[PDB]
Subunit: 318 residues, 4 copies
């Protein structure tokens, strides 16, 4: 199996642990956490959003979770002292948020450690979204998995561009913040909060030909975990509700199998908690206006889709 | 004063009462409510969103609110028995939700009662949005004030069409719901996509634009303050600054008192009880390519609409 | 298998369907619902709180759920026209809220149909709480399963009275909900409400009911509620002795009914719990010789619904 | 007027600014904040809970709010460098949460500074609750105003003890929130029980009662308006009517302006911004047996406490 270590046990790290533990060709050899061991085990077992999970402590105080039966637990805040090579980790999943740059995360590249995947946008760092541009990977030692919002948006842009040619698009993310710029200085409270999110630049990293043609924003909403992306697109080729439906359905069967899904059951946001998909298209709400414009909406769990792609990327770059 | 009666004391009726009570050239002569007198008084006085409000009972058990010092309180569910004419009302603000059609609301027309404004979309009913097409009013006896969502989106459409010529637009309403199979879902804390007939609603007040627009709503569990998100494609070229400038200029002139601009980077709860039909989010205006813009605006889904209701009452009188 | 019908597909009716479908000795033979068939199916399959559940439609348009393979679906508002007898139903789980009285629910009784359990407090109706007084059943044909609040509090009152002898108690239910106060917007408010605790407890523990009273505070969270008992006892208590008395009851007389949380969990961890009450072990406290505070969680749909079916199996 | 300075502009410091600005015998001469001046002015003016407030910048970059027309704005994190004496401050309202101890806050006692009131429980610090034990104040230079919870419960305990003699009481605080493993869980939408050292807290202000009372808090995800729920056992026999009368009488007399009664059957949101330490829920008072009662009371988590903080400032200045 591919030997990985997870650095950081916030929400993303915890979800990565749970996801990676279920992949038969992964072995988690080490977790580094600011939490004491017993607290870490509690947090893995009990989750306000994703429910209960099986995890045990071995007699030797390693963790035993799924396929990963011998997980060393560390608690070293100083990246220069942290030694994942001693656990024979090959791939570091960097989930602390304290090293989100090429230079900072490169400090992990010690002795036998092969690669780092940063679970966030990272300054000066090659960025990949599984299903979108991962096949452009060329042995880079330190990469970014972008954001949950880009992982939802970028597949949809790619499908729709390949089918109808995107001339321009406007994206609104409805970002569910319950479990997650002067407007930031206020209590979130139960407010709707608009925020700029650098969509164009973010898309440019993984779809360089589209980034300059798209922009948008986020609206933060006090609901839990499940977010929605709202794409308003202008295409070169003429479109209908049916042709757009077909292009998305077909991609989910083929090039985006396991990454994009379609909801034909008229479900609501809570139905997608813990979904593994990067995006789940809201089929019945696909609409067109004029010859060349469409609106496409898609759900995503802002933790689980991203975490599944993070471990997909680990498997791929190995 | 213009003598009005309010039928229904749900959320819109209550807000209409509060608004009307503060207008010097309005007199609320009657309120018909399914609530008992004392309950009605409590609901007028204490509001979980809009706060506390001064109201008294007179000795003779009429209500006393602001400029309306002698409001008769009725409790008659049958519109054919209901007689607002006994209080010399000239205009009905129809807020019950039970008579949202021309045929049904025409039952109000008797004796002194010459006009009805329905506080909702209504079948076969002439529909007006103040600032958008109210000047086309031609003495119709029963009209609709449309919805809160249309009152926010239609002004923005008209301003931007006049400036840049709308070719197409997509409108997402983020509809605050704290106060179709998806509707069978105990909303809980769900986000809920909903079709809303945007094209038809806009066609009623901007016939030239209705066919060029569509969209939807996303119901969200926050209170009162909603947002509309317009994605527009224009004939003329645009920029953030030129869109900003067109909206700002409209708020000084033809949409004064109807559309406002937020330049202070506020959040939703800052607009609770706002009287505007829409408050443009200045800093979040954006464009892409030569011809496309995104415009967001806030609105309180009760208070903007209720202010317009009474504006329309004064105008049609 | 014992053949039951569910009348009403609100929250409690849906949860009773799901629970009953997983019990091998129960066959659901009919459901009556104001929803159209396809909508009912959707609501059984998809739940904003309890998650996704497997359910299928047969060719003949009966439902197939768990051990209940051939469920007749009805839609009849008139209790006199409605006939669960045609599916050979012995017991009705009455969950509409429209017939919460002995007189009203008696109309179910016809043919195969021998018994009704009303899923709420019902006027003039023999009331039982499983593990508290169900063994006092003497074949009554219409019974009430009381409320979710009483199913949580009555077991705890019984355990603690037997151990230490209740002199008096005050109960506060924090009731998760996602009289002029009822005209006020739910969401956005803590709402105190009287709930006739004393009377409700008197129905199932007649000696205790007069010694207790309380109220509820309605809070905008989903499903998982808490009961907060402040008790004065004749015998002396400590955290340790109270803890021990509750723990022992969970192993013995209240096994499967009351549980203890020793893991310091929070409310959302008990969503879908089958227990009538889960005691919050670390938050038990005493003061003076004679006073204790005991908290317990409960899912206000699932524990109650498990009890509903438990009671069906018992009175059969 | 009494010259005060406010250290810290979190929620409590912001409320203290607004309350103090409206007191004719107070002058706020300085505010120390981690925020830049323009951001502070924004936070004072616009509040998600208490609404909009008038505040202006003077030409000389002081703030002008209510009776405080010349407020100096500082941004010094190091308490040893911070010089409130340069603004002739007499009373420091210590609202940062970084110096909640006698030793730590005594660093404020420089040059012309006369007194410090800490807006939190503080280690080794004389603690006072206005209306409960403030008349026991004896010139102490550093004091604590306790917590918002204690400010609600202690007045009720004192009133009811004086009337009927508390033998024992059990207190549950329903705390509206917008080592203890439960704190490792993002609050989220959860109800969260927490031990809160009620007995010790009460002991500080009512030493004779602290040993007879205990309790806990349940954290609930509603904004600002909290409830205290007291279950009391008395020496003297009580009735609903006698308990009602005792509370009503105290609100007219010894607790005028501190405790009030709600006879209008209102709900939590109706008390947002209330200045009272506690608002008794009159219709929900109940007794059982001869000697036991339950009493509930509302309070705004911020405003009641902030009003008392400035009341205490005015009191100790004299
Ligand atoms: Na009517
Ligand atoms: Na105009
Ligand atoms: Na503004
Ligand atoms: Na509006
Ligand atoms: Na008691
Ligand atoms: Na304390
Ligand atoms: Na006072
Ligand atoms: Na207080
Ligand atoms: Na005062």
């Amino acid at each position: 199996p591919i030997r990985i270590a997870i650095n950081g046990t916030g929400r993303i790290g915890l979800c990565a642990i749970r996801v990676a533990s279920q992949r038969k060709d992964i072995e988690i050899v080490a977790i580094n956490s600011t939490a004491e061991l017993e607290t870490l085990l509690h947090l893995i077992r009990h989750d306000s959003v994703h429910g209960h999970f099986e995890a045990q402590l071995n007699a030797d105080r390693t963790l035993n979770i799924g396929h990963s039966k011998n997980i060393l637990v560390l608690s070293e805040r100083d990246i220069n002292k942290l030694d994942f090579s001693a656990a024979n980790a090959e791939i570091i999943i960097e989930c602390t948020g304290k090293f989100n740059s090429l230079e900072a995360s490169s400090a992990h590249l010690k002795n036998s450690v092969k690669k780092v995947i940063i679970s966030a946008p990272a300054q000066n760092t090659p960025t990949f979204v599984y299903g979108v541009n991962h096949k452009n990977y060329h042995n880079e030692s330190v990469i970014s998995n972008a954001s949950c919002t880009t992982n939802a948006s970028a597949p949809l842009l790619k499908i729709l561009d390949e089918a109808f040619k995107v001339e321009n698009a406007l994206l609104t993310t409805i970002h569910s913040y319950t479990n997650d710029d002067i407007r930031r200085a206020r209590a979130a409270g139960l407010n709707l909060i608009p925020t700029s999110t650098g969509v164009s630049k973010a898309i440019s990293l993984v779809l360089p030909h589209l980034g300059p043609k798209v922009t948008g924003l986020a609206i933060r909403v006090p609901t839990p975990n499940v977010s929605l992306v709202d794409l308003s697109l202008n295409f070169k080729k003429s479109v209908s509700k049916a042709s757009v439906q077909h292009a998305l359905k077909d991609a989910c069967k083929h090039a985006f199998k396991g990454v994009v899904s379609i909801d034909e059951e008229r479900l609501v946001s809570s139905d997608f908690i813990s979904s593994p998909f990067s995006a789940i298209v809201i089929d019945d709400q696909i609409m067109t206006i004029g010859e060349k414009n469409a609106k496409v909406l898609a759900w995503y769990d802002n933790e689980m889709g991203y975490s599944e792609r993070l471990i997909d990327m680990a498997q791929y770059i190995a």
